[PDB]
Amino acid sequence: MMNRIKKVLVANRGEIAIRVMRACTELKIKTVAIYSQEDTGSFHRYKSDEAYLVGAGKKPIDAYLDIENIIEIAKESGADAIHPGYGFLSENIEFARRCEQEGIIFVGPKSKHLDMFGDKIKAKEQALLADIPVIPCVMNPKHIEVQILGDTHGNIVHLFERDCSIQRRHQKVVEVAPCNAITSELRNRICDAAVKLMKNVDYINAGTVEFLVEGDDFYFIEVNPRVQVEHTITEMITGIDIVQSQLFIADGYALHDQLVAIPKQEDIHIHGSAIQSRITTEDPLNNFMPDTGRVDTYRSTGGFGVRLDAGNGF
């Protein structure tokens, strides 16, 4: 089923690590997990075919940033490719550069894309070269992102938008797709705007373009060159497995190859509406400080229209 990618090492932890692993097994790809010492018990370690300790001796977070140890493990284990997930090293130039150099497929865009979009300014720049709106401080805006996919063969699709406006102290809390309270016309101006930018730089794999909206204008603010936490809600309204798509793209296929099954832009539609809620140990009765300890009872839920993507809640 896969051309070059026979084994993927998932260089992350938690929820997104499990998501990737699940997409890999669906495509018959072998998985390799990494865990910090501190994460010796994280359940994502039990979801992969192989697991290896990383960052021995480093601090909890630094251990998942140990590029060279990750490369050692990638190579040791026979990993054709690395999925960096979100956060951690997913947006880190040295890490992409460093994979490319080792002939290890980086399941993401090219290093130069992380470069032009690692900076808050050189992004502004690229948005100007694209000929799309930007800010020159905005009143009561909606915060609205557009999902982009793009293959190595110059095809580039969008998967409509997500409304990420519900925030607490500027951190996302509930995400809704699509943005129910805007017009079809505005939706396209924004969506086409993000395609324009992402084609303009020949963007590769999954990425997201963020916009602020006031009434009927919108203004570019950011590109995240990675999967996002809320991609879930987009898969739900469009039908398109984003994480499999990522893998397919990086292997070398093209969006519409019948196996990858991504429709033509005209044939991509919105079906229904979806909401995401992130369940965390942040205690609202204690200033949202994360609780700790053993989870003695954990019982999730089910039924029609329900999706669960488990982090370290088992």
Binding site: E26, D49, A51, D241, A261, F314
Partner: protein, 759 residues
Amino acid sequence: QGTVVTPFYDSLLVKLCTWGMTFEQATRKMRRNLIEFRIRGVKTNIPFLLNVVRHPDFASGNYNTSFIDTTPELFKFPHIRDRGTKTLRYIGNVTVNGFPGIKHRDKPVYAEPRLPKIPYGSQISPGTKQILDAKGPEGVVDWVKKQEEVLLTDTTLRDAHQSLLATRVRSKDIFQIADAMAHLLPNMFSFEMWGGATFDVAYRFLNEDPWVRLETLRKQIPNVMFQMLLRGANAVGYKNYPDNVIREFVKQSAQSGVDVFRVFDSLNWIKGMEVSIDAVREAGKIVEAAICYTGDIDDDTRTKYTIDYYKDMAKELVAQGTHILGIKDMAGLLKPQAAYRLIGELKDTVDVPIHLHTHDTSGNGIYTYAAAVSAGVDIVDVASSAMSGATSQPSMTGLYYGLVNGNRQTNLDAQNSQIINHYWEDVRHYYKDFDNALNSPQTEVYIHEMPGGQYTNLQQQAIAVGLGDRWDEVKEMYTVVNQMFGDIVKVTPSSKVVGDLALFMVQNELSEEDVYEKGDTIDFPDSVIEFFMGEIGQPYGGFPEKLQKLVLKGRTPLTDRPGALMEPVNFVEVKAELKEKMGYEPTEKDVISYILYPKVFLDYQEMINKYGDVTVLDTPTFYKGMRLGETIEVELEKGKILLIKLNSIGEPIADGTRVIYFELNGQPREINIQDMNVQARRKIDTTNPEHVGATMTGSVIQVVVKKGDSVKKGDPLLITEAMKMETTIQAPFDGEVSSIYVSDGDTIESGDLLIEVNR
């Protein structure tokens, strides 16, 4: 999680539904989800749904109502993965009942052992193994002649622990250092790493495969030659065996990666090695025919085992065609001045390199090695310091430092060998229970001549049989008996004969004269009859005739190699018999192992079927189980780990069965272990009618049922006394008997839970 499914309603646990933009997509997600599910406690129908979903007629989209009842591939299921459950069954069993033959005690808290830090993807030097591959046996020999330094064979992975730790060192602990060994010790002539008592001890006591050890290691150390110790006549086995068995064993040993065969006879009878030697030549490998040292050539009183003796035999062995001449001082009897003279003379006499092997029993090992080195010896056997001394080999680093300022040096890297040594320093603690050799010089061996190993061993039996008080008597008798036999070379198996008879003569108040007088009325141990029968070769100088006559009792001693006289084994027949017993196709290796150790081979199979490949466990777990609240990591294969934790240990029911409460990779698991060694009364759950409980205060006369018995309503479960007047507790329904909380005898009160009857 924690539900009790009952037999009354449908069985349904959960409806799993998956979706795609296409059927094809949905099928992949169903596949993943069925596999990713974990359900334990009860069997499920998942193996079957997978078969359906994977079938290409399912994927095609074209199936009809008679798809299943006519696709019989759907009902062939794979061999279950229950490696976890097995591992838990092993651990729970040693934790509750202890490991056999050692005192049962809390598992200690151990240091993690110091592993040498090797740069990642570093570069193993070629060594002596490459020379063999390119230029064969003669190439290695020529090479050896060129070297001014003395060369080192390392015995740490075989004779060293055979001597100090009852050969109990496990493959896991050996693999873990092998990589480093390759990188850090590339200049060794060889690694003695197989043969001796390791073959049977691996199977019999470690529940692991010696062939796997040899083969895993071969890859791990590709630069240095592997050496083994072979008893000529009987290989590594316990008998005599027909020639084709010996040749097959050797052939496989050679394929599997053994490069140098040290071949000896326990009586120095050259005929007894002739098959083996020839087989080694034919495999393209190195032959190290060996002469066993005994007596004391510095003492002319003693006229049997003299320097001319060793010289004659050195020549015959070159004539018989050995690449390297080995001198095997099994008991550490070769004093230093005699080493100088012996090695000197033998160098004047034969044109092959010489390989010396002593034991540091007396404290003079190194000194003896320094003498040997001054006289030209080509190769000597040493061990890591932490596994050296006493009845082991002298220290490899000890030797390096003792010679580094002499006329003649060793090629070793002290620092490297010290770093390796640390690993063994640590790991040795795991084997405390087998570290029983009193580890200090014993110069008495110059009187009695008991080999390194058999001293600790023979003492054990003496103690076992109530003679621990009289060990000195037995050591004196051991000496007497060697004289009674006309003075023989004592090493396995000649040594056993001398120990068997020594024990017997002490046990039965028998002197030497007592045996000459009343010998025709006395029944001597089987090994002694066998010895005089000729069943382990012919002693130099031959049997003493009067004593032979008394022991055999008219029996007619053969005068040839017992392998000449034996029906060759039929490998095709034996392989089929075994296949039957194992229930699948055995390897050429399984077969030879079954031939050599039929019983213990099958006991090994029985064991790994019950508990899986327990080889993989860390040694402290292997011998001691788990502490409450401990977590271990069990490496099944690189990258594939069982994180196992032990939470608690259930109270026993009547037959001793406890439930052991584990978490395995996040999954709570409950396994039943019968406590064999048991030194609060449960009441019923009034709600549950599967509970059968006592009605009044009294006792249990008789329990009439066993766990798993089928019952029909009204049937007799047990009988309870109430002031001596018997009354009979019956089944309240049809069902199956479960746990039984009481025994004939037990006193009981009303409410007391007695028996459980599942529907």
